[PDB]
Design an enzyme around this catalytic site. Structure first.
Site, PDB file in Angstrom:
ATOM      1  N   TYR E  26      26.922  38.956 -26.147  1.00 47.46           N
ATOM      2  CA  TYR E  26      26.493  40.031 -26.962  1.00 47.46           C
ATOM      3  C   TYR E  26      25.391  40.902 -26.850  1.00 47.46           C
ATOM      4  CZ  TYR E  26      23.424  37.056 -29.785  1.00 47.46           C
ATOM      5  OH  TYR E  26      22.520  36.155 -30.085  1.00 47.46           O
ATOM      6  N   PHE E  36      17.803  44.959 -30.806  1.00 48.24           N
ATOM      7  CA  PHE E  36      17.200  43.997 -31.269  1.00 48.24           C
ATOM      8  C   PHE E  36      17.340  42.769 -30.903  1.00 48.24           C
ATOM      9  CE2 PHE E  36      20.560  42.246 -33.861  1.00 48.24           C
ATOM     10  CZ  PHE E  36      21.698  43.196 -33.751  1.00 48.24           C
ATOM     11  N   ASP E  37      18.621  42.424 -30.443  1.00 48.78           N
ATOM     12  CA  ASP E  37      19.103  41.146 -29.853  1.00 48.78           C
ATOM     13  C   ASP E  37      19.915  41.295 -28.598  1.00 48.78           C
ATOM     14  N   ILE E  56      28.040  34.965 -38.542  1.00 42.66           N
ATOM     15  CA  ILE E  56      28.010  36.040 -39.582  1.00 42.66           C
ATOM     16  C   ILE E  56      29.402  36.394 -39.512  1.00 42.66           C
ATOM     17  CG2 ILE E  56      27.431  37.910 -38.097  1.00 42.66           C
ATOM     18  CD1 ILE E  56      25.750  39.018 -40.326  1.00 42.66           C
ATOM     19  N   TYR E  82      24.684  40.814 -42.897  1.00 40.29           N
ATOM     20  CA  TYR E  82      23.368  40.741 -43.499  1.00 40.29           C
ATOM     21  C   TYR E  82      22.982  41.891 -44.808  1.00 40.29           C
ATOM     22  CZ  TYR E  82      21.989  37.928 -39.659  1.00 40.29           C
ATOM     23  OH  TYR E  82      22.163  36.833 -38.555  1.00 40.29           O
ATOM     24  N   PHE E  99      27.618  45.888 -31.873  1.00 38.18           N
ATOM     25  CA  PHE E  99      27.666  44.826 -31.103  1.00 38.18           C
ATOM     26  C   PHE E  99      28.386  45.181 -29.635  1.00 38.18           C
ATOM     27  CE2 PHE E  99      27.119  43.026 -35.035  1.00 38.18           C
ATOM     28  CZ  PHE E  99      26.061  42.237 -35.032  1.00 38.18           C
TER      29      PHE E  99
END
Lengths: 775, 360, 138, 363, 107
Positions: E26, E36-37, E56, E82, E99
């Site tokens: 991902y 961010f990731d 999640i 979140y 994503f």
């Protein structure tokens, strides 16, 4: 814009460097959740690419390296550096294979060492996990490509420095060497580097001395990289010392096996003897009845009698010569000579003006030129553990590292909760109870008291303070040597406990009380200043009431008995030991109490002259009315304070044999104690009945333990010798309680705890007294 | 009131006393016994006398009669340099009023001083000398306190009264010269000289802190920063003052920053007045001075950091967002996280949860 | 003082508590404490167990440790009398004399004095081993 | 409980190794005499302009001591290096040539240090203690007495020059405070110590370190002897400059009478020794436990009397007049009384001739 | 909910079954377009077992709707992912997440 473009842009480069500094600071001294947040902001790959980059500016490269170390290796490196000083080597089969010399010195830092060190805990960063307190782990790095990559950068930098280029990476030789060497030094401290990596690093350090290009020490260097070189050499010397300690432990195991076999043989031979002499049997009895420390001292005395064969003595002498040879005593080709010559040359070439470099360089110089002294200093921290307890010892060491990690962190809810969990874990481990010497050598008591003082300096987080105090008290109760070690900080603890917290549970004053109990030596060693501080606190306890009691809605009075009750208990513990009174401390306690009349209750003051019996009657009347006074009742508080004062006065009386001998001090003290409190007060207090069961409020009830203090006073200071006096006091106070107990012995009232308390009273305060004066 | 306190009060400026003989010509002669001389407080400037109102009470120089304020020295109860000498530290002396003749002794550790006729046997006093630095600092405290009190009274005269003259020039010169006085030593000097200068600077700052000048500076700057813009001060005061207002406030911030540079006590004094600094941080005019003040406070006193809550951090983030990308705010933020080897977890969490997540 | 117990005894105590420490918090009920004591084989009386619990629900490992040490002090004292009887005389058959006192004073391990040995003998060729042992125990 | 002591072989090996390590470190490596200070001080002072490594080391210690702080931290390195330098110059019928050669060797070994700046460092770090006892100040005094050993002249001149140039006043305050704290024989404490010594030398199930704990009375005997030896060597050689400077310093703001403070300490020691004699007035003989404490106090009195002598020696009128006007006369009368009674008490017996010899030496 | 925008084709037959381990790569992307990731930066596949609550809710539901070898763009609403509190210093509150994920193997 390219990160490389910031070379010309000074303002943006400065802002980014300080941004990296902020990134480090927010993720400094633990805080692994923030480390995960930074890993979100700065990716693993991004950091790796920057580390290998050559065109990056100096400040940016240094900040990136420091960021990587601070968010990926900092906590584990700190824990390993903390563990680096404690030597716990189990007697594993690998331990017995350790040899002091190779089958000339070997390469330092390479080989096998069985010293017990906790493993590293890492958690991979995954930022889509469900939102969930557990102590979150530090971020995870591959840590395998990092080893070879750091070695590769080190080799490339050494080659480039040998090439003598005019454009060093980062703009200067310092910016090229200091950060990569910092990373390499941290990796060595962590212990990730293997035997081959350590050998290659040693070859890079010195190509000629350490051989099994040009050396990195040989080439010219500025001071900043010299600091990291000094750190690296210090780590290598520490590794060599650790290897020496491990070999010494292995020889210790071998020699103790031989010695115990020889001692059993000697025991058999002595038992077989029939008519040797009146001294040979005496020699055997002396050798076999002394404590094991004494025995091992007598058997190890064959230097410069000793019932040991020449073979084991020769073996020990051979090991001694080997150890002296290893230390460099001889009574560059080795690490000691190389480091010494490098330090001397470094100091000679230039006048270094950086204090840290001077300090560290001379610390190495002393460590290398005094190897035997360093070994002697490090030996007390060394210990030996059985191979069967390695897992429990590892858990204990992990808990110790966790509790040590809180030394440099401000106290808060999550931190105090984790602190309590660590205390519970260290309680539940059995090694803490099996080996008190190991527990003291690791010195958890020092850091526990440091945390207690840090939080104490209104005191927040009371539960953690109470659990800390309980841990300290149990550590005192574990062993007498630990009791001595805790008593060494008695004044420090009393200064911490100058004002009683008043919270439920253990208090630092209770730690002080448990620190000196059931030991005549500590009581005799109790200095003047601690007792003076205690009596000063007691005197200040008589001028004003407790702020907590006033804030709790209790009626305001001129003093707080609850605050002084703890001081009276501590004094009682410090005066009375092993069923006996110590004269030296009793003298001091009596004089210090009598110097300040405010220490006594307001009733016993000369001005007011209320009287002890009248004071207790007024206390009972106050306890009768709920309006006039879990929730502490003021009447019970004053009653308990006066009972504790009477108990301290009684237990402080001189011993009977001293009175019989006629020593002046004992007679004078008995006279002054008689003058302080009349016998009529004692007989009146004993006359007062107690409610019996519909059981009364136990906290506010007239506890028989008050009468226990009273009868202790009566038995000690005055005594019973006259038939009329005995009969009168007995009739007035003693028979009704026994009759009440006999009446309450019925099954309906047998289980009542009031009956149990009054029974404990009768059988442990009065019945021995009646037994003693039976004739 | 006049006390006989002992301890830390000995090193403070209030303990200093000056002795001025009645005669003006050849007033520097050695102090002989029985010489009629006066005693005055160097800092407050008042004159000590045995007035009938409250016995031993110090009085202002506007009313101090010779027969009421003169003093004499006697060894026992019983022109030119002239008489040789009375020793410093080894020669005792008994204070006595010239007219009344009553001995000086403790009336009753804040014990009041009264002139009882009986006195006491241990009422004698022996003299010790004070170096140049202490006297110079104390007289500067006196002069600056007088000038600053006059300035603040003039400021309060026209408070909320839109339309004498405020001594702007003298005040500005005093601020500049005090800034020069409290200048930190340069790093080029050797360790011995630099350490001596630093110790002298710390002693001078401690004397100013004990004298109460810091509170007066806070009062003056609070009064001057009530107004928003120079036109507003022009409205209440005038054009001439409005012109110099920016300089006055800049120099006041500079002096406030300098008075608390490196000393732990001065910055720990701000443990309760931090919210004032955070509230006045957001002002446009004279921003570098207040930022430097906050940076010094945060770096010097560890106990200050525990007071800070979420709103102060958010205000600092607002300053960072509204005043460009300057590295001083970011240094302040870095100093917020760690103080001399101990980490504050709460403020670290607030910093990592306010500025970083936004990504803007 | 918990140093009286041997490592084998402390290991047995740890195993006994872990047999009923499935919760992991360390808390043990009073009935659970009695069950653990029965597993140890002591089989103490209910009144004595209640008195011991009230002296120091909320039973944890250190508290049970201290209680077991206090209980085993009695067993150590029980073995102490036999040890003293067998150490006063090696054969323990009418071998009581001043020579035994001299040998004990020479190699007591605490560096006793001749006058101290004489005083101990006076406390009380011919001698009584049991009486001398009782006097030494005071 | 001594009878029920378990033998060594029954104990497990994991603890037998522990006590083997303890006995080994206590009895074998500790007694090994390693003389290596001379080699270090020779290697560091070779210099191969730029100061030699020894000068850099002295400068670094001076810089550390000069840094302003509430109290100097117990620096393990400074204490260790200070001993290394101190033992180096301590040591490496007899004819005149041999004695002169040994003296010249001692002066050369002292010049190996005092030209590098050792005296300035010692004065700085003893002045920075702010009047507090400790092991580090004890090592500083060791280095001071080693440098001033033999009554060296140039070292005293350098100390005077530096002390007058700096005009610091905290040095004499530190000396005064340190001398105030010095202990004197205390009857009450001795009583506690001898009561503790009456307990068993073996604790239940373990050895007792009461004998190894050390005496509680006259604990700072080495420290007091070293301080007074340093003071007397500071005034050694009939140096009139220091004999006038110690009594009163003209340049400094406040004058501290070191000589009067020494007399006050001597009077305190006299009162303590008189009380101690009065405690042993009744007893027919003197116990060895009290005899050792008496001999320690006797040696301390000898050291302080030698220090006072070395102050007085030389035609220094000011010090002589100051001492004539002090309380030294009452002290001397008390000494004479206690000495006379002590001589007669010892002459009553014959088993304490060594204590009588010490008595006569101090007389 | 989640909207599976098929970036690339994948083998249709294979689908995630409850109790099976899924390996994914991902590349997270914030709503504003910031990153961010990224698992590919770490060079390690994100192993997770389907049917549990370790991952999640939105990513799990989308993974249920994925297929082997297929690429997609799964926007996740704040309530799903979140919501109203985000990972400290990583995801701002009430912000959606995007994503880019493609499956490697299902075993």
């Amino acid at each position: 814009m390219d990160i490389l473009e910031l070379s010309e842009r000074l303002d943006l480069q400065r802002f980014h460097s300080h941004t990296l500094r902020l990134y480090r600071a927010v993720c400094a001294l633990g805080n692994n959740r923030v480390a995960h947040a930074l890993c979100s902001h700065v990716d693993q790959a991004q950091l790796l690419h920057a580390l290998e980059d050559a065109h990056l500016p100096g400040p940016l490269r240094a900040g990136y390296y420091d960021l990587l170390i601070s968010i990926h290796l900092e906590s584990a490196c700190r824990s390993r550096r903390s563990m680096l000083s404690e030597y716990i080597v189990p007697l594993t089969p690998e331990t017995r294979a350790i040899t002091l010399f190779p089958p000339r010195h070997g390469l330092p830092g390479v080989g096998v060492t069985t010293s017990l060190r906790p493993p590293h805990h890492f958690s991979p960063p995954c930022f889509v996990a469900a939102l969930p307190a557990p102590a979150r782990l530090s971020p995870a790095i591959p840590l395998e490509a990092l080893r070879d990559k750091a070695l590769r950068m080190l080799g490339e930098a050494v080659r480039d420095g040998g090439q003598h280029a005019r454009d060093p990476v980062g703009g200067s030789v310092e910016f090229q060497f200091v950060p990569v060497l910092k990373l390499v030094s941290t990796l060595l401290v962590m212990g990730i580097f293997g035997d081959e990596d350590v050998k290659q690093i040693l070859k890079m350090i010195e190509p000629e001395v350490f051989t099994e290009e040009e050396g990195l020490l040989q080439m010219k260097l500025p001071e900043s990289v010299k600091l990291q070189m000094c750190n690296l050499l210090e780590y290598f010397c520490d590794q060599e010392l650790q290897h020496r300690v491990e070999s010494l432990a292995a020889f210790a195991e071998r020699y103790v096996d031989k010695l115990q076999a020889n001692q059993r043989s000697r025991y058999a031979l002595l038992m077989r003897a029939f008519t040797m002499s009146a001294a040979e049997t005496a020699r055997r009895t002396r050798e076999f009845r002394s404590p094991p420390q004494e025995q091992i001292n007598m058997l190890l005395h064959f230097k410069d009698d000793c019932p040991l064969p020449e073979d084991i003595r020769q073996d020990l002498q051979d090991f001694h010569q080997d150890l002296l040879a290893h230390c460099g005593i001889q009574l560059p080709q080795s690490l000691q000579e190389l480091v010494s010559h490098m330090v001397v040359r470094w100091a000679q070439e230039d006048y270094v003006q950086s204090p840290e470099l001077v300090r560290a360089m001379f610390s190495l110089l002393h460590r290398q030129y005094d190897g035997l002294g360093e070994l002697l200093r490090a030996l007390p921290r060394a210990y030996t553990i059985s191979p069967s307890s390695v897992e429990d010892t590892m858990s204990l060491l992990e808990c110790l590292g966790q509790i040590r990690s809180l030394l440099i962190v401000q106290m808060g809810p999550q931190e105090e909760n984790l602190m309590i969990q660590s205390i519970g874990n260290i309680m539940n481990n059995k090694v803490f109870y099996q080996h008190p010497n190991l527990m003291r050598a690791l010195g958890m008591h020092e850091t526990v008291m440091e945390v207690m003082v840090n939080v104490l300096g209104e005191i927040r987080f009371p539960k953690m303070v109470t659990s800390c105090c309980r841990f300290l008290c149990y550590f005192c109760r574990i062993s007498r040597q630990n009791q001595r070690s805790m008593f060494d900080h008695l004044s420090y603890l009393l200064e911490n406990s100058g004002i009683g917290l008043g919270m439920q549970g253990s208090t630092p004053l209770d730690v002080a009380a448990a620190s000196v109990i059931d030991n005549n030596e500590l009581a005799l060693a109790l200095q003047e200043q601690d007792l003076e501080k205690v009596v000063s606190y007691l005197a200040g306890c008589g001028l004003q009431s407790c702020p907590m009691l006033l804030a709790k809605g209790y009626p305001d009075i001129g003093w707080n008995p609850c605050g002084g009750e703890r001081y009276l208990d501590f004094l009682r513990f410090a005066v009375f030991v092993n069923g006996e009174s110590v004269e030296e401390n009793a003298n001091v306690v009596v004089r210090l109490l009598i110097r300040k009349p405010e220490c006594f209750g307001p009733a016993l003051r000369g001005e007011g002259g209320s009287g002890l019996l009248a004071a207790i009657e007024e206390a009972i009347r106050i306890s009768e009315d709920p309006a006039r006074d879990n929730r502490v009742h003021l009447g019970h508080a004053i009653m308990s304070f006066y009972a504790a004062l009477i108990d301290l006065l009684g237990r402080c009386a001189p011993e009977m044999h001293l009175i019989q001998a006629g020593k002046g001090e004992a007679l004078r003290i008995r006279a002054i104690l008689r003058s302080l409190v009349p016998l009529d007060d004692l007989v009146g207090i004993i006359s007062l009945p107690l409610q019996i069961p519909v059981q009364p409020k136990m906290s506010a009830s007239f506890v028989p333990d008050h009468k226990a203090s009273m009868v202790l006073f009566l038995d000690r200071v005055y005594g019973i010798e006259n038939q009329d006096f005995l009969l009168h006091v007995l009739d007035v106070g003693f028979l009704p309680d026994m009759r009440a107990a006999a009446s309450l012995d019925t099954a309906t009232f047998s289980t009542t705890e009031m009956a149990l308390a009054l029974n404990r009273y009768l059988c442990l305060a009065v019945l021995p007294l009646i037994t003693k004066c039976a004739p | 009131l006049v006390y006989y306190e002992g301890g830390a009060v000995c090193t403070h400026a209030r303990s200093l006393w000056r002795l001025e003989p009645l005669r003006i010509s050849w007033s520097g002669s050695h102090l002989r016994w029985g010489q009629p001389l006066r005693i005055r407080h160097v800092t407050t400037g008042r004159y000590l006398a045995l007035t009938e109102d409250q016995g031993l009470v110090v009085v202002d120089a506007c009313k101090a009669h010779t027969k009421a304020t003169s003093f004499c020295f006697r060894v026992s109860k019983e022109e030119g340099m002239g008489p040789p000498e009375i020793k410093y530290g080894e020669s005792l002396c008994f204070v006595q009023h010239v007219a009344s003749g009553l001995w000086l002794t403790y009336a009753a550790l804040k014990k009041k001083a009264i002139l009882h006729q009986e006195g006491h046997m241990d009422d004698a006093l022996f003299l010790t000398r004070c170096q140049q630095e202490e006297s110079q600092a104390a007289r500067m405290i006196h002069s600056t306190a007088g000038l600053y009190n006059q300035f603040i009274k003039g400021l309060d005269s026209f408070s909320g009264k839109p339309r004498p003259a405020l001594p702007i020039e003298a005040v500005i010169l005093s601020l500049q010269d005090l800034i020069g006085y409290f200048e930190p030593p340069s790093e080029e000097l050797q360790h011995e000289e630099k350490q001596s200068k630093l110790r002298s600077l710390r002693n001078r700052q401690s004397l100013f802190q004990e004298e109460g000048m810091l509170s007066l500076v806070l009062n003056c700057i609070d009064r001057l920063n009530v107004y928003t813009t120079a036109a507003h001060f022009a409205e209440y005061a005038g054009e001439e003052a409005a012109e110099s207002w920016k300089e006055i406030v800049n120099l006041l911030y500079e002096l406030l920053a300098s008075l608390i540079r490196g000393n732990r006590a001065n910055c720990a004094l701000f443990s309760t007045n931090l919210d004032w600094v955070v509230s006045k941080l957001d002002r446009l005019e004279a921003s570098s001075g207040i930022l430097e003040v906050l940076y010094c406070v945060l770096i010097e006193s560890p106990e200050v950091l525990n007071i800070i809550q979420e709103n102060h951090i958010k205000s600092i983030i607002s300053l960072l967002d509204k005043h460009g990308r300057n590295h001083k705010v970011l240094d302040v933020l870095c100093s917020l996280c760690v103080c001399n080897g101990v980490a504050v977890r709460s403020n670290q969490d607030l910093i990592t949860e306010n500025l970083l997540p936004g990504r803007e | 003082m918990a140093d009286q117990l041997t490592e084998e005894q402390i290991a047995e105590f740890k195993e006994a508590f872990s047999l009923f420490d499935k919760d992991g918090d360390g808390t043990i009920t009073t009935k659970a404490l009695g069950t653990v004591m029965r597993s140890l084989g002591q089989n103490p009386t209910e009144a004595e167990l209640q008195d011991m619990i009230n002296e120091v629900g909320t039973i944890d490992f250190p508290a049970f440790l201290t209680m077991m040490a206090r209980k085993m002090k009695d067993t150590d004292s029980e073995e102490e009398i036999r040890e003293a009887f067998r150490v006063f005389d090696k054969d323990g058959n009418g071998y009581i004399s001043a020579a035994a006192l001299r040998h004990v004073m020479t190699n007591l391990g605490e560096k006793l004095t001749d006058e101290e040995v004489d005083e101990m003998i006076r406390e009380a060729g011919q001698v009584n081993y049991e009486a001398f042992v009782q006097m030494m125990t005071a | 409980a001594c009878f029920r002591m378990t033998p060594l072989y029954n104990l497990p090996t994991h603890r037998a190794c522990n006590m083997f390590l303890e006995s080994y470190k206590a009895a074998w490596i500790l007694t090994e005499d390693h003389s290596f200070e001379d080699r270090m001080i020779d290697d560091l002072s070779k210099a191969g302009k730029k100061p030699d490594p020894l000068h850099q080391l002295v400068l670094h210690f001076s810089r550390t001591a000069l840094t302003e702080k509430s109290k100097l931290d117990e620096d393990y390195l400074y204490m260790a290096y200070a001993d290394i330098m101190a033992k180096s110059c301590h040591l490496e019928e007899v004819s005149f040539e041999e004695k002169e050669m040994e003296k010249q060797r001692l002066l050369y070994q002292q010049s190996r240090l005092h030209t590098r700046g050792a005296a300035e460092m010692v004065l700085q770090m003893i002045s920075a203690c702010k009047g507090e006892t400790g092991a580090m100040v004890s090592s500083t005094l060791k280095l001071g007495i080693s440098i001033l050993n033999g009554g060296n002249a140039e070292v005293q001149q350098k100390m005077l020059d530096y002390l007058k140039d700096k005009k610091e006043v905290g040095f004499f305050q530190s000396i005064q405070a340190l001398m105030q704290t010095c202990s004197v024989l205390d009857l009450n404490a001795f009583e506690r110590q001898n009561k503790a010594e009456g307990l068993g030398m073996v604790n239940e199930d373990g050895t007792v370190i009461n004998r190894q704990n050390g005496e509680k009375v006259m604990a700072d005997d080495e420290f007091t002897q070293d301080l007074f030896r340093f003071l007397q060597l500071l005034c050694e050689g009939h140096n009139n400059d220091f004999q006038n400077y110690l009594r009163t310093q003209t340049g400094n703001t406040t004058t501290i009478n070191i000589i009067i403070c020494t007399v006050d300490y001597l009077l305190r020691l006299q009162e303590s020794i008189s009380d101690f004699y009065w405690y042993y007035s009744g007893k027919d003989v003197i116990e060895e436990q009290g005899k050792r404490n008496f001999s320690k106090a006797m040696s301390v009195a000898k050291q302080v009397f030698n220090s006072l002598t070395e102050y007085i020696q030389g035609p220094c009128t000011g010090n002589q007049q100051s001492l004539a006007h002090s309380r030294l006369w009452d002290a001397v009368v008390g000494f004479l009384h206690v000495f006379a009674h002590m001589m007669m008490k010892l002459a009553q017996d014959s088993s304490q001739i060594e204590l009588l010899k010490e008595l006569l030496d101090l007389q | 909910g989640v909207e599976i925008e098929t970036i690339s084709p994948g083998d249709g037959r294979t689908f995630p079954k409850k109790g099976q381990t899924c390996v994914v790569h991902y590349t997270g992307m914030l709503q504003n377009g910031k990153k961010f990731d990224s698992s590919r930066d770490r060079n390690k596949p994100f192993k997770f077992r389907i049917g549990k609550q370790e991952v999640i809710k939105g990513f799990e539901e989308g993974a249920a709707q994925m297929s082997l070898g297929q690429r997609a763009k799964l926007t996740c609403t704040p309530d799903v992912a979140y919501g109203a509190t985000g990972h400290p210093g990583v995801i701002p509150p009430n912000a959606t997440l995007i994503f880019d994920v493609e499956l490697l193997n299902l075993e």
